[PDB]
Structure formats: structure tokens, C-alpha cells
Design a protein around this ligand. Structure first.
Ligand SMILES: *[C@@H]1O[C@H](CO)[C@@H](O[C@@H]2O[C@H](CO)[C@@H](O[C@@H]3O[C@H](CO[C@H]4O[C@H](CO)[C@@H](O)[C@H](O)[C@@H]4O)[C@@H](O)[C@H](O[C@H]4O[C@H](CO)[C@@H](O)[C@H](O)[C@@H]4O)[C@@H]3O)[C@H](O)[C@H]2NC(C)=O)[C@H](O)[C@H]1NC(C)=O
Ligand SMILES: *[C@@H]1O[C@H](CO)[C@@H](O[C@@H]2O[C@H](CO)[C@@H](O[C@@H]3O[C@H](CO)[C@@H](O)[C@H](O)[C@@H]3O)[C@H](O)[C@H]2NC(C)=O)[C@H](O)[C@H]1NC(C)=O
Ligand SMILES: *[C@@H]1O[C@H](CO)[C@@H](O[C@@H]2O[C@H](CO)[C@@H](O)[C@H](O)[C@H]2NC(C)=O)[C@H](O)[C@H]1NC(C)=O
Ligand SMILES: *[C@@H]1O[C@H](CO)[C@@H](O[C@@H]2O[C@H](CO)[C@@H](O)[C@H](O)[C@H]2NC(C)=O)[C@H](O)[C@H]1NC(C)=O
Ligand SMILES: *[C@@H]1O[C@H](CO)[C@@H](O)[C@H](O)[C@H]1NC(C)=O
Ligand SMILES: *[C@@H]1O[C@H](CO)[C@@H](O)[C@H](O)[C@H]1NC(C)=O
Lengths: 194, 596
């Protein structure tokens, strides 16, 4: 009619959150937005394995999910239906039959520090596997030995490391930008169209 | 939930902390070598101390897992590397004394300079001076004086330092639950705990002996021809059936025979090969040089560089404001980065060095998806050889014709081919016997068969026995002739050159057989072939996981070294020298001495 709702805050949002606890954003019950999706920020990948997005505005789904974080530039292939290895099976699991669009693009200039960007943690030691679309903020010292923790030492380790960044790095290991689109539906209007 | 899982998690943390600190050290070293400032040296020292302390900490931590109940054969390799590097063993005072001796030997010897006799106005350093002294300057007396100055008064007062250093290093080797320090060196070539292609430390000596026995006649004929050619130049110091003097090999340190190419080549009427004059007329610069060098690796199929290395990796000398000591080396910056530092001048040798460095960096980029203590060559000589082969197989006249710089009017004359083969074979055959002799003597001394008061005597005796080159002036035991070498001063491993020289011809023969080239081996090119590139890539991405025997068998169909490819390569010059050998002398005797 004469109104709509943009993704203006999806990008251009400055501060992001690490893969330590991937934040969740959601919108509903107002006009969607797909015209300006690909008119800027040249994307490194556009694989939409769920449904082809050429006519994405034609059909609608209520309460779409939008996520954003910064992990790496080479392990983007880990985010895929049915694949493991560090991130993909210990920080942000992906459902087997989930349908959605995965967009990843590079912003090395913006998100790198010449003195060393050392303020983006990530977890590589968790007790077990993860369930589809599961998050966690737990902070407990990791143990893999007979003796208890009682501090750090032999077979006592912190469950967190750091993404040290330097602008002089090569392509692939620089901090890229990852955005994930998702949606669900029950008996309700689809609530986001064009 | 097992010991191997705990070790794997420990390695997981190691393969991040070590990556970070190695990147720090690499940045510091690159900044220092591209920019010389005192604070740069300060951060260099800080990074080095941090790395040493970190390695000491993890070597101390390594006691949690006993090194007897591990079976994965990869975690075992990683933990063995951890135990090998970073473990302080000897007492603090002894280690400090040893490090002080090492620091006070090499730097002082490098900075040592000799002044003009009876003239303190001029005191040339090591970099200038002797380089031109061992050159077209034919003054026998001046060359002998330079040799005496560079040997006698330094070997005197360097002998006690090395005499204590060898004992201290024997103590260190015994302290490291090991046999002699020769065994400690041979340890790097030893890999066990595997079936089929197993190796050990008791095979390399026999392999070296067999290779030298097989190669002796070729060196015999070549140096006999060299002596016959040199008889005309100085018919006043060399007996016809005697031995050559030390200071007439074209270099005080020897180890190379490229200098003597000038007054030795036959058929001087036939012009040599060079494109330096045409390059400037065709307006070639450093950027186009490196692009042309990379085009060959692009064509064979291997991946090329990115928006990184090209933008980085300064290639031009920025005058004198940012002057830097530039010896072309391939830099492994780390964390998905690679760099090259090299002063560039428009010359054939600089182009060849650019090819060498490009091959080095291409290999280093080829192997990158491995843990930290796995990214290296299977053997020490592989890393240099994999670039030496590429550098060698680009100056062939067929390669020049493909490039197009050489005019088609150049004639493919057998005399020109003979001259090119002689030029290559000079260095190739010169580098081997002296290296073997030095290694044999150093191993003999480290093990122990002769006392110090007979050390230099036995040195010169076996030098005359094998090398056949006698010192012009007799030397007492106060001097230290082997100590003149920079690598001897830095006690670096020396068998690497022999190993890489043996391996490069195996690689070249196998690759040319894969490319299916017809004709003499030297006239072999891989410009359009791709099977050779695939066969090499089958190994370049392996790393240190698969042993060297397994990798070499998978590449060339052979489980160890063999001099036969080298003999096949040198067959044409062998035939020419056999034909020329009609008025010469076979063999040499050590009875004659330069001092009557
Ligand atoms: C376990 O610990 C051992 C020793 O403690 C480590 O072995 C060292 O490995 C490094 C490299 O991996 C060796 O460094 C090499 O030094 C050679 C000596 O060059 C001297 O002269 C030049 C001037 O020409 C100087 O600039 C230089 O600083 C030396 O003073 C170099 O020639 C080597 O460079 C080679 O490779 C480059 C590309 O990388 C080529 O471009 C060059 O042409 C050349 O072929 C190299 O830099 C060091 O010598 C080794 N130590 C010893 C005692 O030999 C192991 O690496 C370590 N294990 C690990 C870390 O996993
Ligand atoms: C000895 O230790 C090595 C080191 O871990 C073991 O190699 C590992 O083997 C597993 C089994 O395939 C590999 O898992 C696979 O990884 C790929 C990604 O590369 C993934 O896509 C697959 O789904 C699968 O999970 C693992 O990567 C590999 N590790 C390495 C470093 O290569 C080996 O199996 C051990 N051998 C014995 C006898 O214990
Ligand atoms: C070479 O090193 C020197 C000092 O190690 C660099 O000089 C410094 O450069 C930074 C860069 O902005 C300045 O902030 C400092 O004030 C400079 N200090 C001095 C004493 O000059 C120099 O820039 C380096 N060379 C290059 C090409 O970067
Ligand atoms: C490998 O292929 C390249 C091109 O595919 C060849 O380069 C050509 O060489 C001829 C030699 O007469 C030149 O006339 C052409 O101009 C070159 N091509 C280009 C695009 O300039 C190369 O010669 C091939 N390798 C060999 C050994 O022949
Ligand atoms: C944010 O939007 C402004 C215009 O509103 C634009 O100039 C700027 O480049 C944008 N920033 C990013 C990171 O896209
Ligand atoms: C080699 O460089 C060209 C640029 O001319 C590039 O298009 C190509 O992708 C590079 N090769 C590989 C394997 O990426």
C-alpha cells in the first residue's frame, strides 16, 4: 500500500557478536523486504539450498529469523546441511532439512585492527554434540582428566580461544561477515510480503 | 575419554598458541630485515625470548604423557617433535657458557677484517675485498697472502674455542639420552615405527659411501681435465703428477667452481648465451620479470599468487634511506601469507634466483593444511631441491625459444651444448667431493679417533687423500682450517647440500620421463605438460606425515637415492671428456708437495 519494513539494521549495525553466543533477531506482521537485498556489499556466496530466492517476495513465511556474526573467511563451507568440524558441530549447529538462505561476504577493512583485533572469542571444546538451532552462553572450565578442575593445569583447559586479526593477513583467514536467514510457520498469516 | 584424546586436545591448544607466536616472530623478522632500526632489533629480541620461553614451558609440560604408550603415529610424531625442540637439558651454567661461546665465535669471526699490509688506511671487510681477490686477479703472491691472512691468525685463537665446544656438545648429546653427536645429526634422517619403507640411522653412511664410490670416476676425469687446462696458467706451482693448491680454486672457501669457468671453456669462438642486452632494449623491469617467472608455474597448472604477496613483498631497492642486507629468501609469514625479499637487478642470475624463490614460495603455499609441527619438507634438502630443479629447467635453449627473447638466428650447435653442459657440470660436480670430505672429517672428530695435536695433520692428510688438493703452505695444529666456513662456525647441518644434489636429478629424470620428451636429457621442457605437475603435486601437499622413503617411492618409483639419473644427465659431457682424454694423466698421488 503505502508502507513497509526494511532490513536497515541488519547491516550497517557496527558492533557484532562473536560465535560465542550467536544473537537472534526477528520481525513479524509487516511488509517484507527483498528488493535491495543484493544491490550492495558484493557477497562471496549466495547459496540458497532451501528455495530459490529469485521470486522470494512472491511467497511469505511468518516470523522470519535474522542472524549475524563474524567467524572466518575460509570455513564458510562448514555452515551447510550435515557437516561437522569445530564450529559447525560445536557452536552453531544446522538442521538437516532446514530451508533458508546463507549469505557470507568480506568486510576485512572494517573489522580489522592494525594493532591486533583480539576481542572475538570462540569455543572449540564442548562436552557433546549440539542440537539443531541451539545456542549456549555457559562459561565453565573444560576438563578431560581424572582429577577435578581446581584451577588450570595438566588436563585442565579454558574452553575459549581468540580470533586475533591483523590487516596484513592473506585472503581466507580474514574476518568475513556472515548473515543467516530463516523462517517458520504455523496456522497464522505469513505476515511479511511485498 | 582416553590418553590419545587428551594429547589431541593438548595439540589443539598448541596448534593455536604456536601459530600466534610464530606469526609474531615472522612479522618482527620481516620488519627488521626490510628496515634496520635499533628498536626493531629490540622487538626481535623480545619475540625470540618469548618464543624460547614458550617452547621451554611446553617441553616442561610434555611430561604428563609418557612417550611409550602412543600408537596413532601422528600424535606420536607431534609429541616427539615437541620433545626434540624446546627442551632445556643441561645445567644452566653449562648452557650459558655454551651459548656464550657460540655467540662470541660467529659474530666476531664475521666482523673480523684484515687491513692492507704495512698500511692501516684500508681494512676491507669480508663482503668486499676477497670477493675480487679470488677473481680475474691472477697475482699468486697476493692470493697466497690473502689465504694466509684469512687462515693462520684466526685459526690460532679460534682453535681452543672449538676444542671446548666439541666437548661441551658431546656432553649435551650424552645428556640427551643419545649416542655420539654424529648420531644426533643422523637422527633427523631416521624414521621408524612403520612397515615396508622403514629407515634408521645406520643406512645413510652406507648410502653416501656407495654413491661416492659410484661417482668417483666422473670427478676424476673432470678434475684431471681441469688440471690439464690449468697447467698453462701457472706452470710454476703444480707438479704434473702432484696435487692442486688450495687458493687457486677460484674461491678461498671452495665449495664452488663457477669462478674457474672463464679460462677453462673450450671453443671460445662459439658465442655464449645471454639476453641481458636485449632485455633493456625490450624494456623489461622487475614486475615483468616476476610475472614472466610466474607464468610458467601458471601454465603447468599450479595455483598462482593473490592480492597479497604481489602488493606486499618489496622487490626494488629503495635507495640508501631504507637500505637492507638483501639475500633473496622465501619468507613464510604464516597464517595464510607468503612473501619474497630480494634486491632486483636486470640480469640472468637475478632472473634465475627469482625462479628459485618463486618455486620455494609455490611449494610453501602448496603445503598449508597441516598442524604447526608438520609443515616442512620430509628431508632438509627437499625444500631447496624443489626450487633448484625449477630454476635449472628454465635456462634450456628450448625454454628460451619458447620465451621468445632469444632470436631464432641462434644455432643449436653441439659445441654450444657441450659448453653449456660444462658450465653446469663445473659447479654440480665441484660441490660434492668437498662436502663429503668435510662431513666425513666432522663426523670422525665428533665421534673421536684422533687427538687435538693431530687433528689438523689428519685433516690435511685426508684432504690430500680424497680431495687431492694440498694447502700451499704447511699449517700447524694451532690453526683451525675447517673453522673458516660460516656454516662450520654456526654448526649448521652440512649433509643437506649433498642430499639435495642427489635428489634433484632423480626428480628431474622422473618428471622428464613423465613428460615423455625425446632427445638428450638436458633439452627437456615441461612448459605444456601437465602430468609432471600432477605427479609433483601428489607429494608437494603431503608434508612431514608420510616418510621421505614413502613419498619418494610414490613419486619416482624408488625407495632411496641413486646416482644413475645424474650419470645419464652427464653422459654427453662424459663422452666428450673421454674423447678429449688422450694426452692426460689418470689419477693423482700425494707424494708431491708445493713446498718441495
Ligand atoms: C626444530 O629446531 C630446529 C633447530 O633448533 C629448526 O631448524 C631450523 O629451521 C630453520 C628453518 O626452518 C633454519 O633456517 C634456515 O637457515 C639457513 C641458513 O642461512 C643462513 O644464511 C643466510 C644468509 O644467506 C641468513 O639470512 C640466515 O639467517 C642464516 O644465517 C637458510 O639458508 C634457510 O633458508 C632456506 O630457505 C629459504 C626459504 O625458507 C630459501 O629462500 C633459502 O635460499 C634457503 O634455502 C633457513 O632460513 C635453521 O637453520 C634450522 N636450524 C638449524 C640449527 O639448522 C626446526 O625448524 C625446528 N622445527 C620446527 C620449527 O618445527
Ligand atoms: C590418527 O590420528 C589422525 C588425526 O586425527 C586421524 O585422522 C583423522 O581421521 C578422521 C576419520 O576420517 C578424520 O575425520 C574426518 O574429517 C573430515 C574433515 O577433514 C570430515 O569431513 C569427516 O566427516 C571426518 O570427520 C579426521 O579429519 C582425521 N584427522 C586429521 C588431522 O586428518 C586418524 O584416523 C588416526 N588413526 C588412528 C589409527 O587412530
Ligand atoms: C622503519 O622503522 C622506523 C622506526 O623503526 C619507522 O619510523 C617510525 O614510523 C612510524 C610510522 O608512522 C612513526 O609513527 C614513527 O614516529 C617513526 N619513528 C622514527 C624514529 O622515525 C619507519 O617508518 C620505518 N619505515 C617504513 C617505510 O615504514
Ligand atoms: C606452451 O604453450 C605456450 C602457449 O600455449 C607456448 O607459447 C608460444 O610459443 C610460441 C613459440 O614459437 C610463440 O610463437 C607463441 O607466441 C607463444 N604463445 C603466446 C601466447 O605468446 C609455448 O611455446 C609452449 N611450450 C613449448 C615448449 O612449446
Ligand atoms: C551505512 O549507510 C550510509 C548511508 O545511510 C552509508 O553511507 C554507509 O556507507 C553505510 N555503511 C555500511 C557499512 O554499509
Ligand atoms: C592465475 O591467475 C589468473 C589471473 O590472470 C587467475 O584468473 C587464476 O584464477 C589464477 N589461477 C588459479 C588456479 O586461481
Amino acid at each position: 500500500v503505502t508502507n513497509l519494513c526494511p532490513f536497515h539494521e541488519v547491516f550497517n549495525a557496527t558492533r557484532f557478536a562473536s560465535v560465542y553466543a550467536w544473537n537472534r533477531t526477528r520481525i513479524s506482521n509487516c511488509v517484507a523486504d527483498y528488493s535491495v537485498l543484493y544491490n550492495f556489499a558484493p557477497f562471496f556466496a549466495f547459496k540458497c539450498y532451501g528455495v530459490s530466492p529469485t521470486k522470494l517476495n512472491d511467497l511469505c513465511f511468518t516470523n522470519v529469523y535474522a542472524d549475524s556474526f563474524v567467524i572466518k573467511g575460509n570455513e564458510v563451507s562448514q555452515i551447510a546441511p550435515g557437516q561437522t568440524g569445530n564450529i559447525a558441530d560445536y557452536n552453531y549447529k544446522l538442521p538437516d532439512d532446514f530451508t533458508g538462505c546463507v549469505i557470507a561476504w568480506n568486510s576485512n577493512k572494517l573489522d580489522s585492527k592494525h594493532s591486533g583485533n583480539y576481542d572475538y572469542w570462540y569455543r572449540s571444546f564442548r562436552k557433546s554434540k549440539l542440537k539443531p538451532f541451539e545456542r549456549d552462553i555457559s562459561t565453565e572450565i573444560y576438563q578431560a582428566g581424572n582429577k577435578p578442575c581446581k584451577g588450570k593445569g595438566p588436563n585442565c583447559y579454558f574452553p575459549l580461544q581468540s580470533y586475533g586479526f591483523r590487516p596484513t593477513y592473506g585472503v581466507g583467514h580474514q574476518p568475513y561477515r556472515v548473515v543467516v536467514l530463516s523462517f517458520e510457520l504455523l496456522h497464522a498469516p505469513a505476515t511479511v510480503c511485498g | 575419554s582416553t590418553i590419545e584424546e587428551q594429547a589431541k586436545t593438548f595439540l589443539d591448544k598448541f596448534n593455536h598458541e604456536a601459530e600466534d607466536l610464530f606469526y609474531q616472530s615472522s612479522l618482527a623478522s620481516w620488519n627488521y630485515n626490510t628496515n634496520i632500526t635499533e628498536e626493531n632489533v629490540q622487538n626481535m629480541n623480545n619475540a625470540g625470548d618469548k618464543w624460547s620461553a614458550f617452547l621451554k614451558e611446553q617441553s616442561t609440560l610434555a611430561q604428563m604423557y609418557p612417550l611409550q604408550e602412543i600408537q596413532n603415529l601422528t600424535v606420536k610424531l607431534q609429541l616427539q617433535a615437541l620433545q626434540q625442540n624446546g627442551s632445556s637439558v643441561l645445567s644452566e651454567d653449562k648452557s650459558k657458557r655454551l651459548n656464550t661461546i657460540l655467540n662470541t665465535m660467529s659474530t666476531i669471526y664475521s666482523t673480523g677484517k684484515v687491513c692492507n699490509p704495512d698500511n692501516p688506511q684500508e681494512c676491507l671487510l669480508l663482503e668486499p675485498g676477497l670477493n675480487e681477490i679470488m677473481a680475474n686477479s691472477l697475482d699468486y703472491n697476493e692470493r697466497l697472502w690473502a689465504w694466509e691472512s684469512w687462515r693462520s691468525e684466526v685459526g690460532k685463537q679460534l682453535r681452543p674455542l672449538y676444542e671446548e665446544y666439541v666437548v661441551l656438545k658431546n656432553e649435551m648429546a650424552r645428556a640427551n639420552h643419545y649416542e655420539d653427536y654424529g648420531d644426533y645429526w643422523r637422527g633427523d634422517y631416521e624414521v621408524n615405527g612403520v612397515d615396508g619403507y622403514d629407515y634408521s640411522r645406520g643406512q645413510l653412511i652406507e648410502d653416501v659411501e656407495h654413491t661416492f664410490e659410484e661417482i668417483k670416476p666422473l670427478y676424476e676425469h673432470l678434475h684431471a681435465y681441469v688440471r690439464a687446462k690449468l697447467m698453462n696458467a701457472y706452470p710454476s706451482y703444480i707438479s704434473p703428477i702432484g696435487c692442486l693448491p688450495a687458493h687457486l680454486l677460484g674461491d678461498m672457501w671452495g665449495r664452488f667452481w663457477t669462478n674457474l669457468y672463464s679460462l677453462t671453456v673450450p671453443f671460445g669462438q662459439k658465442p655464449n648465451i645471454d639476453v641481458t642486452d636485449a632485455m633493456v632494449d625490450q624494456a623489461w623491469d622487475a614486475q615483468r620479470i616476476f610475472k614472466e617467472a610466474e607464468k610458467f608455474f601458471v601454465s603447468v597448472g599450479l595455483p598462482n599468487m593473490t592480492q597479497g604477496f604481489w602488493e606486499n613483498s618489496m622487490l626494488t631497492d629503495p635507495g640508501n634511506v631504507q637500505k637492507a642486507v638483501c639475500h633473496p629468501t622465501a619468507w613464510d609469514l604464516g597464517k595464510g601469507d607468503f612473501r619474497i625479499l630480494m634486491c632486483t637487478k636486470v640480469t640472468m642470475d637475478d632472473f634465475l634466483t627469482a625462479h628459485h624463490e618463486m618455486g620455494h614460495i609455490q611449494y610453501d603455499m602448496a603445503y598449508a593444511a597441516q598442524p604447526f609441527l608438520l609443515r616442512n619438507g620430509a628431508n632438509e634438502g627437499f625444500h631447496e631441491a624443489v626450487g633448484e630443479i625449477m630454476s635449472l629447467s628454465a635456462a634450456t635453449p628450448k625454454h628460451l625459444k619458447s620465451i621468445g627473447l632469444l632470436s631464432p638466428d641462434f644455432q643449436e650447435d653441439n659445441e654450444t651444448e657441450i659448453n653449456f653442459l660444462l658450465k653446469q657440470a663445473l659447479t654440480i660436480v665441484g660441490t660434492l667431493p668437498f662436502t663429503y670430505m668435510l662431513e666425513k672429517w666432522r663426523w670422525m672428530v665428533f665421534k673421536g679417533e684422533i687427538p687435538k695435536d693431530q687433528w689438523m695433520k689428519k685433516w690435511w692428510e685426508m684432504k690430500r687423500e680424497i680431495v687431492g688438493v694440498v694447502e700451499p703452505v704447511p699449517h700447524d695444529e694451532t690453526y683451525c682450517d675447517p673453522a673458516s666456513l660460516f656454516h662450520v662456525s654456526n654448526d649448521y647441518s652440512f649433509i643437506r647440500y649433498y642430499t639435495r644434489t642427489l635428489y634433484q636429478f632423480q626428480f628431474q629424470e622422473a618428471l622428464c620421463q613423465a613428460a615423455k620428451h625425446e632427445g638428450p636429457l638436458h633439452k627437456c621442457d615441461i612448459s605444456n605438460s601437465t602430468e609432471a605437475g600432477q605427479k609433483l603435486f601428489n607429494m608437494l601437499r603431503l608434508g612431514k606425515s608420510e616418510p621421505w622413503t614413502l613419498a619418494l617411492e610414490n613419486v619416482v618409483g624408488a625407495k632411496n637415492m641413486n646416482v644413475r639419473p645424474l650419470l645419464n644427465y652427464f653422459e654427453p659431457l662424459f663422452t666428450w671428456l673421454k674423447d678429449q682424454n688422450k694426452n692426460s694423466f689418470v689419477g693423482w698421488s700425494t707424494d708431491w708437495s708445493p713446498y718441495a
